[PDB]
Design a protein around this nucleic acid. Structure first.
Ligand SMILES: [Mg+2]
Ligand SMILES: [Mg+2]
Ligand SMILES: [Mg+2]
Lengths: 184, 142, 71, 65, 212, 72, 102, 143, 152
RNA sequence: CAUAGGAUAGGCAUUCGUCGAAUUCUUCUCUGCGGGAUUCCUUGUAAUGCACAAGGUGAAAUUUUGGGCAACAGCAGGUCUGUGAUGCUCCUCAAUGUUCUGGGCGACACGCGCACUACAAUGUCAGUGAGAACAAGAAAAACGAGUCGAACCUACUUGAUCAAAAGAGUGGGGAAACCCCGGAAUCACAUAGACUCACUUGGGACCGAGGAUUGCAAUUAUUGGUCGCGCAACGAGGAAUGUCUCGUAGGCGCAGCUCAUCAAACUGUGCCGAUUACGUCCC
């Protein structure tokens, strides 16, 4: 009678795969009954890639002093986010998130290694910076807006999942890659 | 409140010689007149029979004339004696509650009372200085 | 879990000299000998002495150890 | 963008140590011209070996050491 | 209620702390070396450790008689409640508190600073001590102050085990030109009974035993 | 600026009962800028449409309530 | 029985056990039917002062602690039999207290 | 004619949850008297339920479990309870059942989350002088 | 079919239902009955000096003293001051750090005084406040109503 | 089967100032000494060695974690405002002694360190629920009945046929025994609660008027509470700059300490609980 968890008793983890075959090990699709787990994912170096991807959205919401430590809020705030994403897309919302993480961060970047040489981006940072730049930007959208945070977060996830440029992350994902293409 | 707007809905109503934003709720627009505030505007809406859900511009002229005598003379409506602004009123002795133009008027009469006699709390207002026990070395900056 | 101090290493060679026959390749039995053959107060050192003793018993199965004086 | 696999991490490079010099095998579809090709490239971010990553212009090679 | 057990450990500590200061000032030239007081019904014991038991006792006990009733009149003891004794230190060379008071008098009698301090360390190290360290700081040579330390033997300093093994005492010497402070540290050798020194060995000495 | 009305006109309440049940993903902030009404009315206008079964309540909390059209 | 409770309080951890185990080893010889010595929680006493007598330096501190060890033993003997158990010259710094329960 | 009863404990930070697992006619699991349909945040009711859910509802079939938690605040009392329940099933199968029926359901707990069974050893680190917390120092200014 | 017996369990009590569902129906029972004695001060006053404005629910003295009645069911022997810790607040001081304040025991004194006149509270043997046997009948019977969804 | 009512375990139904009796226990609690961890085991680095990485084992895995203690030299660092620590030198009876009385240390064109509070909707309010750890606590060779009282903290009632803040009774506690089932605040809530993007129900500076407590004394408001004011900036902050690698940062409160009265402090403690790196010598 192990009834294979959905997510909020609603959204299944049965069909998740990743379009980016570069990013399959770093986006974890293991199942959970809630985002909150309270485990130590930061002891070892790459262990936070084994953390479930829906938890890592909840950790990205706990920013700026008004949110540090409010994980039960961010789990609630993502509960309404994933239901809105189902109404915009008519799809499994967890596949919409894994499609948003896979498109959200730039494949290439430019740093000074010695001039300002173009450097490749590891698959770990590409999962970090996609989650980082979607929680950012959805946070800045709803800062003095009529829209709630579960709508502004749901809009950044949808437009990055489609690869539209309306998302905050995809404006910066394309700005970094063209600067990296010119700083080769 | 799932009710349609009336034909007479003023966006700015005028009560006690004060413009009042009729788009707000009824106590929170009734605190815009001086002397009232939130804790007293809920008592003017309670003693007048005004529902707190309604917006301030729907208040009719018979409802606004009832409000203005709850604020001018609140002790007739059993709002208690401890609730009022001016309770023992030196040089008068009687408990009052000061309306819009009267708060700033008798504030100037209190600062003039303490400056006629050379009381120290009136000397601080003559020099523009801080009146209570603040230090005023690093934080005035006016 | 790093380099053994010369307090641990000089004492561990003396356990191998005086008590070579009572010791084998196991930690948890060599520890029980060293509690009866070393009068020190710390349990942290007696764990480290029984670690380096066990190490230089595996070295004596292979060949000679310098400074062992087994005689 | 071609997906290449890190077969070797050649050490932390750059001044600040944030850039990593790797040796990436290109992983093409085995009938291709540029199959089993290995390149020495700079990776920005935490990278272990056997970590796939996407490459925009694979015809460059970084200057080693 | 009576004071709490937390309030009585305080007043029993401030009792011993004040009793220690009184006898440190009185019996400085009697070679004072510590107090232990034992309290029970019908009597409160006070045992005084010294090097000169003919002097801390009077001619018929006169000195301890006065020294008894100074403790009685201060702490409001009643007649029969307070009894004092004098025991002597068995070694005199392992007591850092006695040796620093003598080194205080070697300077105050206008002897040379280095001759006095090596006279301590020769006497301490012949008395079975493992090590000793005398520090004299002050205006030793002239107008500007110096510090000299004089050393022999072992000395453990960094552990918290040095409270068990190292005996220390610091006094002030009131010169005519200023103030000199002297320190004497003595590392206690042995005495598994606790006569002078701990029972257990040093924390790092392993001492593997020989087989039968 | 963003000047929103604080009660319904008769014109815009007819917008509430017709266009809003045709939307997918109704929230009181979607209605607040489409219909130019305050959210305190938009949330009150949508609680009315649930008890008439014109819209559906798909997700509810004390603060955030998400509504959808009923498909029949 | 009279149920006399003896309270052994002390500042030394090695002296409070050398009284209590000695006091208990006395009260087995008369077969008194004791209720065993319980270890009440040790109360530590913190005074955290500055280290400096002056004002300057890095503002360093040092916490001082003082633990009170606390034991009680309940025994059913009469009131002059418990004075036979109690009477022995103890170590210095250990307070014993005779109390009669009800 | 008999009493089959097992007491287990769980600790997370300071929350010590003692689960008294006993055999009854009906399953009835309640944490401090609240019947586990009524633990108030739906997030934290789901962490206490996955003590029951990763192993199966069939194994808690006729077991009355009483979880009494004290200490440690809101979220730590869920991880203390869900560990006291998950340890409580297994220690009810250490006795009263064989080892083959256990140690499959022990490993179903261990495969899901390691903290259904062992403990999370992390405690608060002490505040030190010169620091606002365990680690953050006073602000240095230089001018 | 959300209301039915679960297995063999046949009844309800407090701590078997939702806490707000009990307090809301008990507040609903008190005003529909009419035998409550609401004081005249509850119109003017504020629940504590830690609250900054008036309770703005016209049934607030019914929701209080139903929460208090639940807070005698759990913790018998609770006084007015133990109830003040239950309903206390974090007070907003202006530019100073917020501190916890316990609620005014005045309204908690009226709340227990009203419930004694119902006969639902007895003044305790030695401690503060105790639930009368009529109150145990009331608290559990109303709590069975809220699981079979008869909120009224 | 809520006014509109979702999601989510199930031999002997369940609940407990009920200020019940009994009769068996140590699972949690307290704690004096003691076990346990050692690179121990495993298979690449290194190549004899000393050791290292990854994994196992485990409660814990590499100084286990966090602190204490820390040599030798020295600084013309600070302290003569800690001492009945001190040399020299000044003052020494209208005294630079010492006590009163009254001021001042706190005064504000200004410039800086450090906090605190915010600039709001991941919110303010008003409700309601669940629910911590460290801790403190009363008195003398006095005045009263060698023994006992009162000083200290506190529950509980009262005040209450009507605001807080009080003011009073009556218990208990020398502190694992009473506070206490320590009802902290973040948080939580399907609360069918108000606000709806505004300098606004954000913010609470400024000051007006009652009132009550501390004190021998409140004026240059001691502090709390009540109603006003809120039209005082402040819409996320230039050049610059500080701290931090896991139960951590940040947030959140609570104790103790200063204390008759007063914490935006400090010393402690718990609660909620992350981002990133696990690198390098660029500064
Ligand atoms: Mg004599
Ligand atoms: Mg500073
Ligand atoms: Mg500027």
């Amino acid at each position: 009678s192990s009834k294979t968890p959905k997510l909020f008793n609603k959204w299944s983890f049965e069909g998740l795969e990743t379009s980016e075959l570069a990013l399959r090990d770093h986006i974890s699709t293991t199942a959970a009954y809630v985002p909150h787990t309270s485990g130590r994912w930061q002891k070892r170096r790459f262990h936070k890639a084994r953390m479930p991807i829906v938890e890592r959205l909840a950790n990205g919401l706990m920013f700026k002093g008004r949110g540090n430590g409010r994980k039960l809020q961010a789990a609630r705030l993502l509960k309404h986010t994933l239901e809105i994403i189902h109404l915009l897309t008519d799809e499994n919302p967890l596949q919409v998130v894994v499609d948003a993480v896979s498109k959200g961060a730039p494949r290439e970047d430019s740093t000074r290694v010695g001039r300002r040489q173009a450097v490749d981006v590891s698959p770990m940072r590409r999962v970090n910076e996609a989650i980082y730049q979607m929680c950012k930007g959805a946070r800045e959208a709803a800062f003095r807006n009529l829209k709630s945070m579960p709508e502004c977060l749901a809009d950044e996830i949808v437009n990055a999942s489609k690869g539209s440029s309306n998302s905050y992350a995809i404006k910066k994902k394309d700005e970094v890659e063209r600067v990296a293409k010119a700083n080769r | 409140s799932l009710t349609l707007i009336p034909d007479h809905f003023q966006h700015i109503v005028r009560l006690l010689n004060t413009n009042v934003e009729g788009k707000r709720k009824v106590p929170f627009a009734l605190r815009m007149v001086k002397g009232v505030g939130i804790r007293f505007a809920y008592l003017v809406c309670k003693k007048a029979g005004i529902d707190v859900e309604r917006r301030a511009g729907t208040l009719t002229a018979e409802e606004l004339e009832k409000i203005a005598e709850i604020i001018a003379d609140p002790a007739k409506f059993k709002i208690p004696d401890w609730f009022l602004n001016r309770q023992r009123d030196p040089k008068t002795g009687k408990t009052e509650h000061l309306s819009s133009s009267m708060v700033d008027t008798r504030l100037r009469e209190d600062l003039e009372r303490l400056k006629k006699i050379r009381a120290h709390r009136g000397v601080r207002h003559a020099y523009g200085l801080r009146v209570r026990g603040q230090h005023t070395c690093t934080t005035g900056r006016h | 879990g790093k380099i053994r101090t010369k307090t641990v290493k000089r004492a561990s060679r003396q356990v191998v000299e005086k008590y070579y026959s009572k010791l084998n390749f196991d930690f948890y039995q060599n520890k029980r000998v060293i509690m009866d053959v070393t009068i020190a107060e710390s349990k942290k050192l007696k764990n480290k002495i029984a670690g380096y003793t066990t190490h230089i018993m595996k070295r004596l199965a292979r060949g000679p150890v310098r400074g062992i004086s087994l005689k | 963008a071609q997906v290449g696999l890190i077969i070797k991490v050649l050490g932390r490079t750059g001044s600040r140590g944030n850039v990593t010099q790797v040796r990436v095998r290109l992983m093409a579809e085995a009938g291709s011209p540029d199959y089993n090709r290995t390149i020495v490239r700079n990776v920005k971010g935490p990278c272990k070996e056997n970590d796939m990553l996407s490459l925009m212009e694979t015809e460059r090679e970084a200057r080693r050491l | 209620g009576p004071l709490s057990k937390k309030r009585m450990i305080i007043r029993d500590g401030v009792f011993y702390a004040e009793l220690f200061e009184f006898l440190k000032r009185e019996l400085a030239e009697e070679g004072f070396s510590g107090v232990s007081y034992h309290v029970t019904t019908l009597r409160t014991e006070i045992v005084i450790k010294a090097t000169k038991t003919r002097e801390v006792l009077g001619v018929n006990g006169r000195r301890i008689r006065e020294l008894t009733a100074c403790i009685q009149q201060r702490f409001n003891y009643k007649e029969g409640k307070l009894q004092l004794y004098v025991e002597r230190v068995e070694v005199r060379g392992l007591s850092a508190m006695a040796q620093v008071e003598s080194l205080r008098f070697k300077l105050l009698s206008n002897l040379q600073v280095r001759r006095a301090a090596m006279g301590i360390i020769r006497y301490v190290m012949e008395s079975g001590a493992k090590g000793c360290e005398v520090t004299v700081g002050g205006k030793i040579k002239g107008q500007r102050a110096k510090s000299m330390t004089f050393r022999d033997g072992y000395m453990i300093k960094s552990g918290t085990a040095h409270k068990s093994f190292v005996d220390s005492a610091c006094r002030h010497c009131y010169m005519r030109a200023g103030c000199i402070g002297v320190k004497v540290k003595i590392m206690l050798p042995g005495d598994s009974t606790g006569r002078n020194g701990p029972s257990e060995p040093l924390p790092d000495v392993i001492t593997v035993i020989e087989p039968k | 600026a963003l000047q929103n009305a604080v009660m319904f006109d008769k014109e815009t309440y007819d917008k509430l009962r017709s266009e809003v049940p045709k939307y997918k993903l109704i929230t009181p902030s979607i209605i607040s800028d489409r219909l130019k009404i305050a959210v305190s009315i938009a949330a009150a206008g949508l609680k009315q449409l649930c008890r008439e079964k014109l819209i559906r309540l798909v997700s509810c909390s004390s603060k955030t309530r998400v509504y959808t059209r009923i498909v029949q | 029985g009279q149920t006399v409770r003896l309270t052994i309080t002390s500042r030394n951890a090695k002296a409070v056990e050398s009284v209590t185990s000695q006091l208990l080893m006395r009260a087995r010889d008369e077969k008194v039917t004791i209720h065993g010595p319980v270890r009440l929680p040790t109360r530590t006493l913190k005074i955290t002062t500055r280290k400096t007598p002056c004002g300057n330096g890095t503002n360093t501190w040092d916490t001082f602690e003082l633990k009170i060890y606390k034991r009680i033993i309940d025994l059913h003997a009469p009131t002059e039999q418990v004075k036979k158990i109690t009477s022995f010259t103890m170590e210095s710094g250990v307070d014993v207290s005779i109390t009669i329960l009800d | 004619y008999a009493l089959k009863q097992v007491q287990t404990f769980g600790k997370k930070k300071t929350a010590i949850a003692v689960a008294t697992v006993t055999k009854a006619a009906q399953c009835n699991i309640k944490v401090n008297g609240v019947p586990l349909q009524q633990i108030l945040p739906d997030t934290l009711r789901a962490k206490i339920m996955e003590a029951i859910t990763v192993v199966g509802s069939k194994y808690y079939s006729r077991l009355r479990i009483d979880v009494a938690v004290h200490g440690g605040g809101q979220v730590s009392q869920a991880y203390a309870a869900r560990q006291a329940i998950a340890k409580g099933l297994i220690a009810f199968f250490q006795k009263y059942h064989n080892e083959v029926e256990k140690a499959a359901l022990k490993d179903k707990f261990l495969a899901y989350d390691k903290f259904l069974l062992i403990a999370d050893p992390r405690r608060c680190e002490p505040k030190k002088w010169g620091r606002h917390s365990a680690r953050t120092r006073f602000t240095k200014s230089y001018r | 079919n959300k209301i039915h017996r679960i297995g063999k369990r046949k009844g309800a009590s407090l701590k078997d239902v939702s806490a707000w569902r009990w307090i809301k129906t008990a507040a609903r029972h008190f005003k529909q009955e009419g035998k409550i004695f609401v004081p005249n001060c509850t119109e003017i006053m504020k629940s504590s000096h830690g609250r900054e404005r008036a309770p703005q629910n016209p049934d607030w003295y019914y929701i209080r003293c139903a929460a208090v009645l639940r807070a005698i069911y759990l913790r018998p022997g609770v006084g007015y001051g133990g109830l003040s810790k239950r309903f206390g607040n974090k007070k907003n001081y202006g530019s100073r750090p917020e501190h916890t304040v316990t609620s005014s025991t005045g309204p908690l004194h009226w709340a227990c005084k009203s419930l004694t006149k119902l006969g639902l509270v007895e003044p305790g043997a030695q401690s503060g406040q105790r639930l009368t046997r009529k109150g145990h009948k009331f608290a559990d019977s109303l709590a069975f109503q809220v699981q079979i969804r008869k909120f009224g």
